Amino acid sequence: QDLYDAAKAYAEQLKENGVINYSVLDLT
Amino acid sequence: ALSKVKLNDTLNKDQLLSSSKYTIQRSTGDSIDTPNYDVQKHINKLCGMLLITEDANHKFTGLIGMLYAMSRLGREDTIKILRDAGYHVKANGVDVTTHRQDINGKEMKFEVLTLASLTTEIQINIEIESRKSYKKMLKEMGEVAPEYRHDSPDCGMIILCIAALVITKLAAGDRSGLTAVIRRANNVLKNEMKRYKGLLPKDIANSFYEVFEKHPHFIDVFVHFGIAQSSTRGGSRVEGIFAGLFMNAYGAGQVMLRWGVLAKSVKNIMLGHASVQAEMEQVVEVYEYAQKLGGEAGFYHILNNPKASLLSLTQFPHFSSVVLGNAAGLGIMGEYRGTPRNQDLYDAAKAYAEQLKENGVINYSVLDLT
Amino acid sequence: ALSKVKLNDTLNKDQLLSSSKYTIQRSTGDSIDTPNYDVQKHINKLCGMLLITEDANHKFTGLIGMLYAMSRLGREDTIKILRDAGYHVKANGVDVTTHRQDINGKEMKFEVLTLASLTTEIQINIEIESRKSYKKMLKEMGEVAPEYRHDSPDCGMIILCIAALVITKLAAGDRSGLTAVIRRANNVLKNEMKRYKGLLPKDIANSFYEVFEKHPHFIDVFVHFGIAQSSTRGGSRVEGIFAGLFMNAYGAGQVMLRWGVLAKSVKNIMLGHASVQAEMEQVVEVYEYAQKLGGEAGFYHILNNPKASLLSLTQFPHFSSVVLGNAAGLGIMGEYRGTPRNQDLYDAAKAYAEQLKENGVINYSVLDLT
């Protein structure tokens, strides 16, 4: 249960939000 | 030869710490919110909401202030400055999600930042209480101007202006400067307080005092933000006020270093005293060490730097007394809680310093008169 | 030529030891606990529990202090510093497990570190006795503040502050400085003792004295932790205390080296004496050797370094006497247990040194008076 709650806590932090990553695009 | 018997301890101590093979990394915690440039505009709005709110709850404004400073830096840079400081950081992203909640029966939408440190339940309450103050403001003056509203771009920096006043008085390290922080926030930043009801110097300063105390890594983030902010080519007058208020912090926790140059400038006779001259070999070492560091030594006490103790002149009782006496005689100290170790040298320096500032006759040799 | 007949023994002895083909590795023991950054926050809590406990048992605080220092370094580093020192280390991990035990009938849970050196049975007793003192504290002041509680981040470094005071007086090597360690721990760290009942300088210092004596490898761990701690950019004022108190240890076990520069600075006439001048060729070699090592030579006596004996001026009877006499005449030694080999040179140096510090007339040639 402890590993489940710790993984759930971070997984919530992972999906959290949504910034644009400009290094992915081939911008000149 | 007797010239060779010497040992530069000050330089060797620095060489020891500079060439450390191993590193310590302090518990920053479970997570830190690292907002990027895209959210900066949302936090400025959140900062504005607190400012327009009459009798606002500035419990989270110290934390919200840091979020705006980190958003101006950007996720990449703010993570970089935390790691360079010496902290393991678990970076939490920050962006916008629409939260639906039914306040007073009616279902309402709210744009909230999904932060770890700040709950979505308290974020909506900042917006709810601001809407109450907004409609009350709208009812009084009919049409609210761009200056009085939360959408203004200054809002974010206005909250960071008193953060720079808090950082200015962090050298004491016991919330003793709070009185001076509120005082200067009324003299400077006076136009800003007219246009915002929720600009409460006491409430906001205590919030920044709390967040710097609870999170020592955020004071490092603010200092490096302020230097990055001051490195800009130009901006608004509020940004200019912040840059001025931030640079007042430069040299905090080391006023005796500046007053020592003043005593040398005004030529206080007690500097030439025998017991003061015995220390002169070692006091030059710290002044030369201060000259060596340069701009780095400015925030050595604000950031509790290990090497801040090396800049101390207090280790020299006699030189400190004449310097602290010179400041007393010129009438520049007070209420400064520094006590002179040698009382006789202090009183003698104070007496001569009082004689230096008397009357005022015109020196005609200074001008280029023909 | 007669200029060629020479032999640099000091440099050649160093060259012999520096270019050793083989290495000795001392019995560190069966196992050492190497905590990482994830546990650091738990040890800080454990350090806080001891601090809030009234009349606490600081039998394990010297060991618990080292665990916090190693947790700040991190498993990878603290293993690296033990291996670089010259020790075969059997690294034991450190993390959190929940232990269930029925104290006074009622079944209770306890978060304990599964340490080899520290039993889980004694860990719960530290938490049990702290809860007693916590509720007694809660009953007296109603609501306990962030300063008085165990959760504060300073707690861990507060215990390491008197560890730095113990390391400052390790040069003697017989717990003789304990009186000075407690004395300074009252002059220094005075605000910390107000906010924690279990800050007992005598009890905690003896614990660190015990752990450094029983485990000589842990004194190497603390010194390299202190250097790594002092290498940081900035932290809290309590970390500023530790950094200042740790750097006071620099140059311990070699005060005669510093007092020799003082005698040269004040220009004691007995330095020019014939028998003192005969030694001047060889005393310069050790001062140049001290200049060569630099910062490395600071903790050569704290860490019982083989090359610490090379920095000794005691091998020179005449120069040591005038230097020890100069210190006596200026009135800076006492109760220093160093005895002069030449008594006549000591008394002559003491007499002149007393004449140097007399009266106090102003030197007007020093100032830039027009």
PDB file of C-alpha atoms in Angstrom, chain C residues 151-359:
ATOM      1  CA  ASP C 151       9.825  19.500  12.989  1.00  0.00           C
ATOM      2  CA  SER C 152      12.094  22.554  12.512  1.00  0.00           C
ATOM      3  CA  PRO C 153      14.851  22.110   9.871  1.00  0.00           C
ATOM      4  CA  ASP C 154      17.483  23.603  12.227  1.00  0.00           C
ATOM      5  CA  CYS C 155      17.258  20.682  14.709  1.00  0.00           C
ATOM      6  CA  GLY C 156      19.764  18.526  12.796  1.00  0.00           C
ATOM      7  CA  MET C 157      22.353  21.290  12.400  1.00  0.00           C
ATOM      8  CA  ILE C 158      21.832  22.508  15.996  1.00  0.00           C
ATOM      9  CA  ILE C 159      23.188  19.150  17.222  1.00  0.00           C
ATOM     10  CA  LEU C 160      26.064  19.405  14.707  1.00  0.00           C
ATOM     11  CA  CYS C 161      26.904  22.922  15.989  1.00  0.00           C
ATOM     12  CA  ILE C 162      28.326  21.548  19.263  1.00  0.00           C
ATOM     13  CA  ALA C 163      29.914  18.750  17.203  1.00  0.00           C
ATOM     14  CA  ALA C 164      31.908  21.527  15.499  1.00  0.00           C
ATOM     15  CA  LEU C 165      32.808  22.831  18.979  1.00  0.00           C
ATOM     16  CA  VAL C 166      34.012  19.330  19.938  1.00  0.00           C
ATOM     17  CA  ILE C 167      36.057  19.124  16.709  1.00  0.00           C
ATOM     18  CA  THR C 168      37.498  22.566  17.567  1.00  0.00           C
ATOM     19  CA  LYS C 169      39.011  21.160  20.802  1.00  0.00           C
ATOM     20  CA  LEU C 170      40.057  17.710  19.488  1.00  0.00           C
ATOM     21  CA  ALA C 171      43.676  18.912  19.127  1.00  0.00           C
ATOM     22  CA  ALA C 172      44.260  18.346  22.862  1.00  0.00           C
ATOM     23  CA  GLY C 173      42.954  14.777  22.553  1.00  0.00           C
ATOM     24  CA  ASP C 174      41.828  14.165  26.146  1.00  0.00           C
ATOM     25  CA  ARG C 175      38.379  15.818  26.549  1.00  0.00           C
ATOM     26  CA  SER C 176      40.119  18.781  28.244  1.00  0.00           C
ATOM     27  CA  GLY C 177      38.328  21.364  26.077  1.00  0.00           C
ATOM     28  CA  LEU C 178      34.881  20.144  27.224  1.00  0.00           C
ATOM     29  CA  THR C 179      34.715  23.134  29.604  1.00  0.00           C
ATOM     30  CA  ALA C 180      35.371  25.532  26.702  1.00  0.00           C
ATOM     31  CA  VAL C 181      32.941  23.588  24.474  1.00  0.00           C
ATOM     32  CA  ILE C 182      30.121  24.111  27.003  1.00  0.00           C
ATOM     33  CA  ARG C 183      31.214  27.719  27.645  1.00  0.00           C
ATOM     34  CA  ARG C 184      31.068  28.641  23.946  1.00  0.00           C
ATOM     35  CA  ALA C 185      27.843  26.628  23.516  1.00  0.00           C
ATOM     36  CA  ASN C 186      26.286  29.100  25.998  1.00  0.00           C
ATOM     37  CA  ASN C 187      27.818  32.247  24.451  1.00  0.00           C
ATOM     38  CA  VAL C 188      27.131  30.907  20.961  1.00  0.00           C
ATOM     39  CA  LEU C 189      23.861  29.114  20.225  1.00  0.00           C
ATOM     40  CA  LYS C 190      22.079  30.967  23.069  1.00  0.00           C
ATOM     41  CA  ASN C 191      18.833  31.510  21.136  1.00  0.00           C
ATOM     42  CA  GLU C 192      18.821  27.786  20.265  1.00  0.00           C
ATOM     43  CA  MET C 193      19.052  26.723  23.936  1.00  0.00           C
ATOM     44  CA  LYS C 194      15.983  28.842  24.791  1.00  0.00           C
ATOM     45  CA  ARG C 195      13.814  27.086  22.186  1.00  0.00           C
ATOM     46  CA  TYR C 196      14.999  23.545  23.059  1.00  0.00           C
ATOM     47  CA  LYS C 197      15.074  22.045  26.573  1.00  0.00           C
ATOM     48  CA  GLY C 198      17.229  19.083  25.489  1.00  0.00           C
ATOM     49  CA  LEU C 199      20.103  21.208  24.179  1.00  0.00           C
ATOM     50  CA  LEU C 200      22.608  20.058  26.813  1.00  0.00           C
ATOM     51  CA  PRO C 201      26.158  21.098  25.776  1.00  0.00           C
ATOM     52  CA  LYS C 202      27.863  18.774  28.293  1.00  0.00           C
ATOM     53  CA  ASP C 203      25.742  15.720  27.412  1.00  0.00           C
ATOM     54  CA  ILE C 204      25.926  16.167  23.620  1.00  0.00           C
ATOM     55  CA  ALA C 205      29.636  17.113  23.522  1.00  0.00           C
ATOM     56  CA  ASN C 206      30.571  13.989  25.512  1.00  0.00           C
ATOM     57  CA  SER C 207      28.550  11.945  22.997  1.00  0.00           C
ATOM     58  CA  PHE C 208      30.534  13.390  20.073  1.00  0.00           C
ATOM     59  CA  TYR C 209      33.770  13.002  22.072  1.00  0.00           C
ATOM     60  CA  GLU C 210      32.854   9.320  22.534  1.00  0.00           C
ATOM     61  CA  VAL C 211      31.931   8.624  18.888  1.00  0.00           C
ATOM     62  CA  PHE C 212      35.089  10.311  17.529  1.00  0.00           C
ATOM     63  CA  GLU C 213      37.242   8.361  20.023  1.00  0.00           C
ATOM     64  CA  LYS C 214      35.520   5.003  19.438  1.00  0.00           C
ATOM     65  CA  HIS C 215      35.260   5.582  15.667  1.00  0.00           C
ATOM     66  CA  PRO C 216      38.213   7.612  14.252  1.00  0.00           C
ATOM     67  CA  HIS C 217      36.764   7.262  10.722  1.00  0.00           C
ATOM     68  CA  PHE C 218      33.699   9.334  11.734  1.00  0.00           C
ATOM     69  CA  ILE C 219      35.905  12.356  12.564  1.00  0.00           C
ATOM     70  CA  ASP C 220      37.114  12.178   8.943  1.00  0.00           C
ATOM     71  CA  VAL C 221      33.461  11.986   7.846  1.00  0.00           C
ATOM     72  CA  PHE C 222      32.521  15.063   9.912  1.00  0.00           C
ATOM     73  CA  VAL C 223      35.487  17.180   8.751  1.00  0.00           C
ATOM     74  CA  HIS C 224      34.756  16.464   5.070  1.00  0.00           C
ATOM     75  CA  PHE C 225      31.051  17.066   5.765  1.00  0.00           C
ATOM     76  CA  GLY C 226      31.899  20.415   7.389  1.00  0.00           C
ATOM     77  CA  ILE C 227      34.033  21.446   4.409  1.00  0.00           C
ATOM     78  CA  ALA C 228      31.238  20.340   2.045  1.00  0.00           C
ATOM     79  CA  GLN C 229      28.713  22.191   4.240  1.00  0.00           C
ATOM     80  CA  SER C 230      30.914  25.309   4.227  1.00  0.00           C
ATOM     81  CA  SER C 231      31.236  25.078   0.412  1.00  0.00           C
ATOM     82  CA  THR C 232      27.510  25.833  -0.107  1.00  0.00           C
ATOM     83  CA  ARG C 233      26.112  29.064  -1.579  1.00  0.00           C
ATOM     84  CA  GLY C 234      23.770  29.915   1.324  1.00  0.00           C
ATOM     85  CA  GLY C 235      21.324  28.436   3.855  1.00  0.00           C
ATOM     86  CA  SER C 236      19.996  29.401   7.306  1.00  0.00           C
ATOM     87  CA  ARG C 237      21.546  31.288  10.252  1.00  0.00           C
ATOM     88  CA  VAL C 238      21.997  28.004  12.164  1.00  0.00           C
ATOM     89  CA  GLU C 239      24.014  26.734   9.186  1.00  0.00           C
ATOM     90  CA  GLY C 240      25.914  30.028   9.456  1.00  0.00           C
ATOM     91  CA  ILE C 241      26.622  29.125  13.098  1.00  0.00           C
ATOM     92  CA  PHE C 242      27.968  25.703  12.108  1.00  0.00           C
ATOM     93  CA  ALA C 243      30.123  27.178   9.316  1.00  0.00           C
ATOM     94  CA  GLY C 244      31.654  29.760  11.669  1.00  0.00           C
ATOM     95  CA  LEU C 245      32.184  27.288  14.520  1.00  0.00           C
ATOM     96  CA  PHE C 246      33.639  24.697  12.116  1.00  0.00           C
ATOM     97  CA  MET C 247      36.179  27.169  10.678  1.00  0.00           C
ATOM     98  CA  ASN C 248      37.355  27.991  14.223  1.00  0.00           C
ATOM     99  CA  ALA C 249      38.751  24.437  14.198  1.00  0.00           C
ATOM    100  CA  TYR C 250      40.965  25.341  11.208  1.00  0.00           C
ATOM    101  CA  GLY C 251      44.574  25.592  12.408  1.00  0.00           C
ATOM    102  CA  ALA C 252      43.943  23.600  15.596  1.00  0.00           C
ATOM    103  CA  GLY C 253      46.921  21.684  16.984  1.00  0.00           C
ATOM    104  CA  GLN C 254      49.285  24.283  15.500  1.00  0.00           C
ATOM    105  CA  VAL C 255      48.830  27.568  17.393  1.00  0.00           C
ATOM    106  CA  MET C 256      52.609  28.030  17.767  1.00  0.00           C
ATOM    107  CA  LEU C 257      52.660  28.474  13.975  1.00  0.00           C
ATOM    108  CA  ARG C 258      50.240  31.431  14.239  1.00  0.00           C
ATOM    109  CA  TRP C 259      51.926  32.933  17.328  1.00  0.00           C
ATOM    110  CA  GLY C 260      55.252  32.813  15.446  1.00  0.00           C
ATOM    111  CA  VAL C 261      53.836  35.176  12.814  1.00  0.00           C
ATOM    112  CA  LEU C 262      52.520  37.396  15.638  1.00  0.00           C
ATOM    113  CA  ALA C 263      55.996  37.681  17.208  1.00  0.00           C
ATOM    114  CA  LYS C 264      57.317  38.592  13.747  1.00  0.00           C
ATOM    115  CA  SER C 265      54.476  41.112  13.264  1.00  0.00           C
ATOM    116  CA  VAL C 266      54.977  42.851  16.638  1.00  0.00           C
ATOM    117  CA  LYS C 267      58.779  42.696  16.125  1.00  0.00           C
ATOM    118  CA  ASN C 268      59.912  41.013  19.352  1.00  0.00           C
ATOM    119  CA  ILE C 269      63.628  41.762  19.849  1.00  0.00           C
ATOM    120  CA  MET C 270      64.481  38.236  21.089  1.00  0.00           C
ATOM    121  CA  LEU C 271      63.832  36.852  17.563  1.00  0.00           C
ATOM    122  CA  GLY C 272      67.194  38.388  16.581  1.00  0.00           C
ATOM    123  CA  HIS C 273      68.994  36.481  19.365  1.00  0.00           C
ATOM    124  CA  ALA C 274      71.970  34.343  18.266  1.00  0.00           C
ATOM    125  CA  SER C 275      70.638  30.888  19.225  1.00  0.00           C
ATOM    126  CA  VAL C 276      67.242  31.758  17.697  1.00  0.00           C
ATOM    127  CA  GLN C 277      68.941  32.822  14.435  1.00  0.00           C
ATOM    128  CA  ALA C 278      70.729  29.447  14.214  1.00  0.00           C
ATOM    129  CA  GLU C 279      67.318  27.752  13.885  1.00  0.00           C
ATOM    130  CA  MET C 280      65.936  30.271  11.342  1.00  0.00           C
ATOM    131  CA  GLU C 281      67.089  28.178   8.361  1.00  0.00           C
ATOM    132  CA  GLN C 282      64.980  25.213   9.534  1.00  0.00           C
ATOM    133  CA  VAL C 283      61.950  27.129  10.898  1.00  0.00           C
ATOM    134  CA  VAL C 284      61.464  28.720   7.457  1.00  0.00           C
ATOM    135  CA  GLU C 285      61.293  25.211   5.929  1.00  0.00           C
ATOM    136  CA  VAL C 286      58.229  24.292   8.044  1.00  0.00           C
ATOM    137  CA  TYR C 287      56.560  27.684   7.419  1.00  0.00           C
ATOM    138  CA  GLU C 288      57.200  27.257   3.676  1.00  0.00           C
ATOM    139  CA  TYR C 289      55.882  23.686   4.052  1.00  0.00           C
ATOM    140  CA  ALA C 290      52.758  25.087   5.754  1.00  0.00           C
ATOM    141  CA  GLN C 291      52.417  27.572   2.872  1.00  0.00           C
ATOM    142  CA  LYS C 292      52.846  24.687   0.396  1.00  0.00           C
ATOM    143  CA  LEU C 293      50.030  22.565   1.865  1.00  0.00           C
ATOM    144  CA  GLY C 294      47.691  25.551   2.247  1.00  0.00           C
ATOM    145  CA  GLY C 295      44.121  24.703   3.270  1.00  0.00           C
ATOM    146  CA  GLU C 296      44.959  20.992   3.510  1.00  0.00           C
ATOM    147  CA  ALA C 297      47.105  21.608   6.628  1.00  0.00           C
ATOM    148  CA  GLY C 298      44.176  23.125   8.580  1.00  0.00           C
ATOM    149  CA  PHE C 299      42.741  19.821   9.824  1.00  0.00           C
ATOM    150  CA  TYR C 300      46.071  17.940  10.060  1.00  0.00           C
ATOM    151  CA  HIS C 301      45.817  17.591  13.867  1.00  0.00           C
ATOM    152  CA  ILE C 302      42.016  17.247  14.123  1.00  0.00           C
ATOM    153  CA  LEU C 303      42.303  14.376  11.680  1.00  0.00           C
ATOM    154  CA  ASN C 304      45.355  12.654  13.200  1.00  0.00           C
ATOM    155  CA  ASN C 305      47.372  13.054   9.998  1.00  0.00           C
ATOM    156  CA  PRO C 306      50.854  11.429   9.913  1.00  0.00           C
ATOM    157  CA  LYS C 307      52.247  14.652   8.385  1.00  0.00           C
ATOM    158  CA  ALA C 308      50.975  16.759  11.331  1.00  0.00           C
ATOM    159  CA  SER C 309      54.286  16.241  13.172  1.00  0.00           C
ATOM    160  CA  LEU C 310      56.129  18.005  10.315  1.00  0.00           C
ATOM    161  CA  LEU C 311      54.349  21.303  11.123  1.00  0.00           C
ATOM    162  CA  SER C 312      55.779  21.311  14.679  1.00  0.00           C
ATOM    163  CA  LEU C 313      57.965  24.227  15.811  1.00  0.00           C
ATOM    164  CA  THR C 314      58.584  22.499  19.177  1.00  0.00           C
ATOM    165  CA  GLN C 315      61.624  20.782  17.607  1.00  0.00           C
ATOM    166  CA  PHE C 316      63.202  24.273  17.700  1.00  0.00           C
ATOM    167  CA  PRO C 317      63.686  25.076  21.435  1.00  0.00           C
ATOM    168  CA  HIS C 318      64.903  28.683  21.131  1.00  0.00           C
ATOM    169  CA  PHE C 319      62.404  29.963  18.541  1.00  0.00           C
ATOM    170  CA  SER C 320      59.531  28.248  20.383  1.00  0.00           C
ATOM    171  CA  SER C 321      60.517  29.960  23.656  1.00  0.00           C
ATOM    172  CA  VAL C 322      60.556  33.527  22.272  1.00  0.00           C
ATOM    173  CA  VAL C 323      57.266  32.877  20.428  1.00  0.00           C
ATOM    174  CA  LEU C 324      55.658  31.381  23.557  1.00  0.00           C
ATOM    175  CA  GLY C 325      57.110  34.262  25.608  1.00  0.00           C
ATOM    176  CA  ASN C 326      55.741  36.880  23.199  1.00  0.00           C
ATOM    177  CA  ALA C 327      52.273  35.331  23.591  1.00  0.00           C
ATOM    178  CA  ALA C 328      52.644  35.435  27.393  1.00  0.00           C
ATOM    179  CA  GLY C 329      53.762  39.086  27.416  1.00  0.00           C
ATOM    180  CA  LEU C 330      50.919  40.174  25.117  1.00  0.00           C
ATOM    181  CA  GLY C 331      48.628  38.204  27.456  1.00  0.00           C
ATOM    182  CA  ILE C 332      46.910  35.939  24.922  1.00  0.00           C
ATOM    183  CA  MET C 333      47.890  32.462  26.212  1.00  0.00           C
ATOM    184  CA  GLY C 334      46.646  30.836  29.439  1.00  0.00           C
ATOM    185  CA  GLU C 335      45.817  28.190  30.367  1.00  0.00           C
ATOM    186  CA  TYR C 336      47.938  26.850  27.489  1.00  0.00           C
ATOM    187  CA  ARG C 337      49.837  23.708  28.552  1.00  0.00           C
ATOM    188  CA  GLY C 338      52.908  24.387  26.368  1.00  0.00           C
ATOM    189  CA  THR C 339      56.181  24.705  28.284  1.00  0.00           C
ATOM    190  CA  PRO C 340      59.209  26.625  26.933  1.00  0.00           C
ATOM    191  CA  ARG C 341      62.405  24.556  26.602  1.00  0.00           C
ATOM    192  CA  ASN C 342      64.560  27.678  27.068  1.00  0.00           C
ATOM    193  CA  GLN C 343      63.330  29.600  30.132  1.00  0.00           C
ATOM    194  CA  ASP C 344      65.739  32.554  29.785  1.00  0.00           C
ATOM    195  CA  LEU C 345      64.606  33.328  26.216  1.00  0.00           C
ATOM    196  CA  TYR C 346      60.968  32.970  27.330  1.00  0.00           C
ATOM    197  CA  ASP C 347      61.346  35.474  30.194  1.00  0.00           C
ATOM    198  CA  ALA C 348      63.267  37.943  28.000  1.00  0.00           C
ATOM    199  CA  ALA C 349      60.613  37.734  25.263  1.00  0.00           C
ATOM    200  CA  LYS C 350      57.814  38.076  27.839  1.00  0.00           C
ATOM    201  CA  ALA C 351      59.471  41.193  29.296  1.00  0.00           C
ATOM    202  CA  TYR C 352      59.827  42.955  25.925  1.00  0.00           C
ATOM    203  CA  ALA C 353      56.314  41.880  24.874  1.00  0.00           C
ATOM    204  CA  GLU C 354      54.926  43.548  28.023  1.00  0.00           C
ATOM    205  CA  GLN C 355      56.796  46.765  27.127  1.00  0.00           C
ATOM    206  CA  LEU C 356      55.309  46.724  23.594  1.00  0.00           C
ATOM    207  CA  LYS C 357      51.673  46.846  24.791  1.00  0.00           C
ATOM    208  CA  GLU C 358      52.064  49.843  27.137  1.00  0.00           C
ATOM    209  CA  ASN C 359      50.183  53.170  27.198  1.00  0.00           C
TER     210      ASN C 359
END
